Each structure stands twice: as structure tokens, then as C-alpha cells.
Amino acid sequence: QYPIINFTTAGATVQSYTNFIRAVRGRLTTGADVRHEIPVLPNRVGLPINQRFILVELSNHAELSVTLALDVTNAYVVGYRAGNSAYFFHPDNQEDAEAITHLFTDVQNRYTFAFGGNYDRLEQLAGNLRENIELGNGPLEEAISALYYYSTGGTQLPTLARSFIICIQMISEAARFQYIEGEMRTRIRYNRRSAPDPSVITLENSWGRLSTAIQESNQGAFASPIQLQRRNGSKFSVYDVSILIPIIALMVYRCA
């Protein structure tokens, strides 16, 4: 089996959430191969299948359990497990398709959706953009229930898509960016729920590109700057890694 990390929305605190994300990160990357002070995820290449994934088990106050599967090479959700059912996004290629076959062999029913996991597709199904979908302990508790009741036809696809967007952001993105972890912490501390602002969203969009620029950078300096947005939507550029140290936590592996 793959490594399992636990979390519950019941009685959650800034500290329980922080422990959870730190634990996730710890399992995602060896910690070796760090660049400009930032840990880099394992190379998808020649990566033994028994090391390809990790598992994230979520529960809420309604006493319900769901288990998410993450790809350690990009920290993204590839599918999940709820009771006797396991569902998978549409793989980008055959190798990834072949890879996910090793997940949740523990169950009879294995489904693969016609749609992938990209925000654009999920937002279309959800009928809402990330900017309009609330995040926090509250939404996560409701996300867990929905994922759980999907085998009954009781939770509609938009609700499922919205739930995928919530989980991905509060887990995958939080793991990738200290910034976004801190964004959930703030929500959890004051027990408020609210949608991600343009600064969160643009970081999500740019994670792949930021990773690339840092690892190919001439000793920290990007060849060409990358443009992001502030909380108020105004735009600004970054020219080197130094400004990103307190912001990005993991990077996708690249050459060299």
C-alpha cells in the first residue's frame, strides 16, 4: 500500500491543519534534490510505481471517510476512494493511465471519468469559477460528504466538480505554496469561508512555469520575468527566486 495521511474537519484548528499539510509535504518529496532552497518533487522518469503515489484520507463531523490519491511528481489529485467505489480523472497519456491501475486495487468498482482534473474543465462542470467557490473548513466538510455520497446518484456532477476544486486547492495547492497554506490557516483560525483571491489563483495557474524558471534560472535570476496578481487584482512581475522563498514550497522536477 501507499502512505496514508489523515485529516478531519471535525474540531479542526490552525495547528491540526498545519500538521496535516507538513505531513503531506514530508511524504511527497525525499527532501533531497533542493534548488535555491526549495525542495523539488521526484522525477516522473524511472520512478518505481510503488513510490508514485500517496494517499490522503479525509473525514468530517458527519463521521464520513474519503481517500484521495496524489501523484508525488506534481502533488495533484488523480482520483479518490469512497467506501466500495474508486474514481479516476482522465489520464493525459497511456503511461499515466497504466500508472493509476496500481491504485485502490483494494476495490471491485473502478471508474475513469471522461474528463480530466484541470481547473477549466471542473469549473465548467461546476458552473462556477474558482473565484466564486468558497474555501475553508466549512466547504471542505461539505466537499467530503458529497464525494462520499456520489455512488448513490444523490450528489450531482456539478456538486462533485465543485468539491474537487475545493479539495485540490486546500490540499494540493496548500502543499505547493506556503502562501496558500497560510490562506487556509487564516480561514480556519477565524472560522470563515471565502473564495480565493486573484493572488491565490494566479499562483495556481503559474506553478508549473515558476518551477521551470527557478530551476533553469541563471543563479536565481529568471531569463524573463513572470507576471502575477495581487489581492486587489493589480498585476506585478517577479524577476528572481529570492522573492518566492516564503511563498512556494514544492516544485515539479525539471532538467537539468
Added chain:
Amino acid sequence: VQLVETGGGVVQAGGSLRLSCVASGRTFSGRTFSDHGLGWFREREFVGSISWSVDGDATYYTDLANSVKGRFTISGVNAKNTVYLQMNSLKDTAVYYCAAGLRGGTYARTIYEYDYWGQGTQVTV
């Protein structure tokens, strides 16, 4: 959301050709055309990409595959939702595609980092 490439055609060896791709669709409309990154491909190989900039120095930044650096150039006109691919010293025959996405632009040299694709256009040296 929807991209159409043109300018494809037959060129003599060592000549020049400019490809064109115009984008249109809901959501442009946050998610304006300017907030999307574009990339040219031609298996499928990365040719070059482009990101838009409102900073002081440039109106956009480009990224070219090594083999192409000293020959091809990329530009764009943001107000017309259009991006160009200027090819000099042709040799290179293939189908040229334009892709776009929130995760596209400079530093995105992989087909999976773009969520939208054009029909392509044929270039024969």
C-alpha cells in the same frame, strides 16, 4: 477557447514564412486573452511560447526552443487577440499548431500545459 492558425503554405528552402493564430471565445470574456499564455508546436515538438506583460519594459515576453532560437521569432498584438510565428531560414516541414491556456506562456514547453488547441496549418519547405 478557440484558435485558428493560418499562413501555412509551401516555401522554398532557405526562405521565410509567418504563421498567424487568432483566438476567440467566451471567457475572454480575470480570464481575458491577456491572461492566457500561447505556445506554438509542430510526434509534437515545442516551438516557442509567449506571455503578455504590462510592466514597464516589454508588452510581451517570448520563449524559443534552442534549435529554433536564431531563426524563428514570436510576436503578438494583444488588442486583436492574435499571435505570430516568424520563421526565417526554413529547411522544418510539419503541421504547426497554436495552443493557449492559463498555465501556458513562457516556461511552458509541454503539450499538457495548454488547455486549448488549434486545427493546425501545414508548412512545407
